[PDB]
Amino acid sequence: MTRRVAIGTDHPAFAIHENLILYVKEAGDEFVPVYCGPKTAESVDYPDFASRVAEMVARKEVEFGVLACGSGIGMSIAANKVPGVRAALCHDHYTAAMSRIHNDANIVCVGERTTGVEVIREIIITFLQTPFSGEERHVRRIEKIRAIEASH
Amino acid sequence: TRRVAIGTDHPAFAIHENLILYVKEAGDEFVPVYCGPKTAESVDYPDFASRVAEMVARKEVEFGVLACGSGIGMSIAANKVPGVRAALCHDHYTAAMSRIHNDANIVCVGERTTGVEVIREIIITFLQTPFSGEERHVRRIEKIRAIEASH
Amino acid sequence: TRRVAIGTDHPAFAIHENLILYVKEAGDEFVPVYCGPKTAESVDYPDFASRVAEMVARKEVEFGVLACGSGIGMSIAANKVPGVRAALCHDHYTAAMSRIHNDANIVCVGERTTGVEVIREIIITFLQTPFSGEERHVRRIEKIRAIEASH
Amino acid sequence: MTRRVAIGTDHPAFAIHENLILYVKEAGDEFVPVYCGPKTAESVDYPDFASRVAEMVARKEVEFGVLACGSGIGMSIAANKVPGVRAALCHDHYTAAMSRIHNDANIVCVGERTTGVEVIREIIITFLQTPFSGEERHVRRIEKIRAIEASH
Ligand SMILES: O=C[C@H](O)[C@H](O)[C@H](O)COP(=O)(O)O
Ligand SMILES: O=C[C@H](O)[C@H](O)[C@H](O)COP(=O)(O)O
Ligand SMILES: O=C[C@H](O)[C@H](O)[C@H](O)COP(=O)(O)O
Ligand SMILES: O=C[C@H](O)[C@H](O)[C@H](O)COP(=O)(O)O
């Protein structure tokens, strides 16, 4: 009954990949990091790593994903291209919490060049720990997102 | 003419006139097309994200501006439309880089999270900042297209 | 009873009732003491920073909340009062750390920069989060006091 | 006719002290970084380094100061304790620009643990490049801060 969390980065965020692994563990003993990012700081293409994590989330191999690039923007765009994925670019505690409470987000995206590591830590912990509210209006809106996916 | 479709849900309705103004402030060539709600009544963000995103995807407008409480819902829903690159921005840097690196065509903002003067800065910066056209960025954007195609 | 003096200038007057509410939301023991403008007309932030800062310095209230356009003016002016440790916060993390590390007694926020729900989070976090009391932080806080004394 | 910019940090921000020096230079050839922070990653007390930079600014030895700690908060508080200093904790381009335009700030404070380095870069460049507006209401308000100092 533990919860798997796939982690991916591109090259700038490779610098903090050990941080990301640690922060997932810090969210609780029930969270198991699955690192899927690169092994060097050599230039790579973020969509490749977004895709790897997003597909795992979509196939339900893991419950959550954590993605980091320079700004988080690339990861959030690429990951959301996978049906079943709800990837939330978060920059603080509030966005991290609300992404779960309102959007039942399954992937958190952060920017290594934009957000300091202790805020990234807080984002990851908050994202993982905060439950989805389950409230009627949110469920309806999430279903509407799914409908958009279905239509394409 | 560079058309900019604008969508909100209910919390961001109170600033929909702001959004129209900020788009215009980016330059005379930027033409706001308001596609959001007509009243303050509660609505569902994906409906308005979808409207704007489809317009961008269809090439009916060049850009979209989406606002909800946090910006998160707008960014998720809009990105579900093939051809859309929706960037949730919270400052000048993210606004600029979404264009320079990601060639983003939709900017998403949170009315409950980001103060209006920063939202103003975000919108203006997003609209005014060109895509770099750099080899690596073009390659990565095409990879995003490939993800869409694979699904 | 833990009293919290509140001050704003004109851009933040629009949310002064929010600020009062957010203080109360932190807990029944938190009592807001509104010391800001009674109207929306232009005022000078240092006048209201001074009023609240002096109350904190005097030990008349435990805490202060100051809001201006960016929070910057409030943070500069309030810190000019000996005994005041005014922290410009823009998120939950800065709100918490201002208390844990700096034992801050005034929180400053920007109405034009930070969305109201984040301002809410900042105020609640600031008031609820205790000072760590750690040796190194105490020492550093004392060095701030010494800077005041040397002037 | 060049413009001297004193730079101080405590220990968490020492890792980016070379960054800070570079970012000041990037603001323009007219800006001269004057590094005054620690020489090592050894734990230090931020008020000591805030004071050194703030005193340089107050005595007019330099025009501007750049201060970095974990959150920027400690630097902001300590530097503002020196009369003649207007130290602005900035977290983005907007606060960086407005601290100059409105507050004629002479010290910019940033958090190494909160703000990513490319945003710190933008903050420093924006802070240094953006002039004070000189507008009547701002001058009056700045004078009122000076009055507060004088009264103590
Ligand atoms: O959104 C994309 C992310 O920010 C990437 O990390 C960034 O574009 C890479 O930039 P560069 O290192 O290739 O210049
Ligand atoms: O991402 C979604 C955006 O934050 C919505 O505006 C929010 O969920 C609306 O919340 P509520 O007004 O229905 O509570
Ligand atoms: O730091 C000062 C705060 O941001 C003030 O609210 C701001 O300067 C007021 O600007 P204006 O309304 O007088 O233009
Ligand atoms: O405001 C003060 C700044 O955030 C300091 O860098 C921080 O308190 C240092 O904390 P520690 O490394 O001593 O735990």
Q: B 27-56 residues with CB below 8 A of D?
A: none
Report the run of H or E that residue A8 belongs to, with start and end.
strand A3-9
CA C137 to ligand 4: nearest atom: 8
Inter-chain contact B115–C117, Cβ cutoff 8 Å?
Answer: no
Give phi and psi for D33, each to the nearest 5: -70, 140
Neighbours of C, requiring at least 3 CB pairs below 8 Å, are A, B, D
Pairwise CA distance, residues C92 & A16, whole Å: 22
CB D142 within 8 A of CB D103: yes
CB A87 within 8 A of CB A79: yes
Collapsing DSSP states into helix, strand and coil, what is residue B7?
Answer: strand
CB D10 within 8 A of CB D44: yes
Structure tokens at B58: 């269809």
Angstrom distances, CA of residue B121 to CA of C112, C118, D95 = 11, 19, 11
Substitution target in A48, A141, A151 with the highest count of B β-carbons within 10 Å is A141
Distance from CA of B10 to the nearest CA of C (A): 15
Neighbours of D, requiring at least 3 CB pairs below 8 Å, are A, B, C
Angstrom distances, CA of residue D62 to CA of D38, D67, D69, D82 = 18, 14, 20, 14
Q: Which residue type does A137 have?
A: R
CB A109 within 8 A of CB A87: yes
Residue C3 sits in which domain range? 1-151
Pairwise CA distance, residues A110 & A66, whole Å: 8
Q: Taking CA atoms, what residue in A is nearest to D112?
A: A116
Q: Is C69 on the interface with B (CB under 8 A)?
A: yes
Q: Is B17 on the interface with D (CB under 8 A)?
A: no
Specify whether D102 is catalytic: yes
* Tally of domains in chain D: 1
Tokens 């690039």 belong to A69
Question: Closest partner residue to C118 among B113, B116, B117, by Cβ?
Answer: B113
Contacts of D118 in chain B (CB under 8 A): 93
Using the CB atoms, write b or e for A18-31: b if 16+ within 10 Å.
ebbbebbeebeeeb
| Experimental technique behind these coordinates | X-ray
CB D128 within 8 A of CB D22: no
Q: Is D43 exposed, middle or buried (0-12, 13-18, 19+ CB in 10 A)?
A: exposed
CB D78 within 8 A of CB D54: yes
| Nearest Cα residue to C100 out of C108, C92, C109 | C92
Contact partners, residue C19, CB within 8 Å, separation at least 6: C6, C8, C12, C32, C34, C65, C67, C119, C123
Give the resolution to one decimal, in Å.
1.9
DSSP D96: H
Nearest CA to ligand 2 atom 1: B73
Q: How far is CA D113 from the centre of its chain?
A: 17
Collapsing DSSP states into helix, strand and coil, what is residue D35?
Answer: strand
Q: Is C34 exposed, middle or buried (0-12, 13-18, 19+ CB in 10 A)?
A: middle
B63 DSSP β-pair partners: B4
Tell me, what CATH number does D122's domain have? 3.40.1400.10
Q: How many CB atoms neighbour CB D131 within 10 A? A: 8
Tokens 């297209």 belong to B145
CA C101 to ligand 4: nearest atom: 8
3-state secondary structure chain C: CEEEEEEECHHHHCCHHHHHHHHHHCCCCEEEEECCCCCCCCCCHHHHHHHHHHHHHCCCCCEEEEEECCCHHHHHHHHCCCCCCEEECCCHHHHHHHHHCCCCCEEEEECCCECHHHHHHHHHHHHHCCCCCCHHHHHHHHHHHHHHHHC
Distance from CA of D95 to the nearest CA of B (A): 9
CB D118 within 8 A of CB A123: no
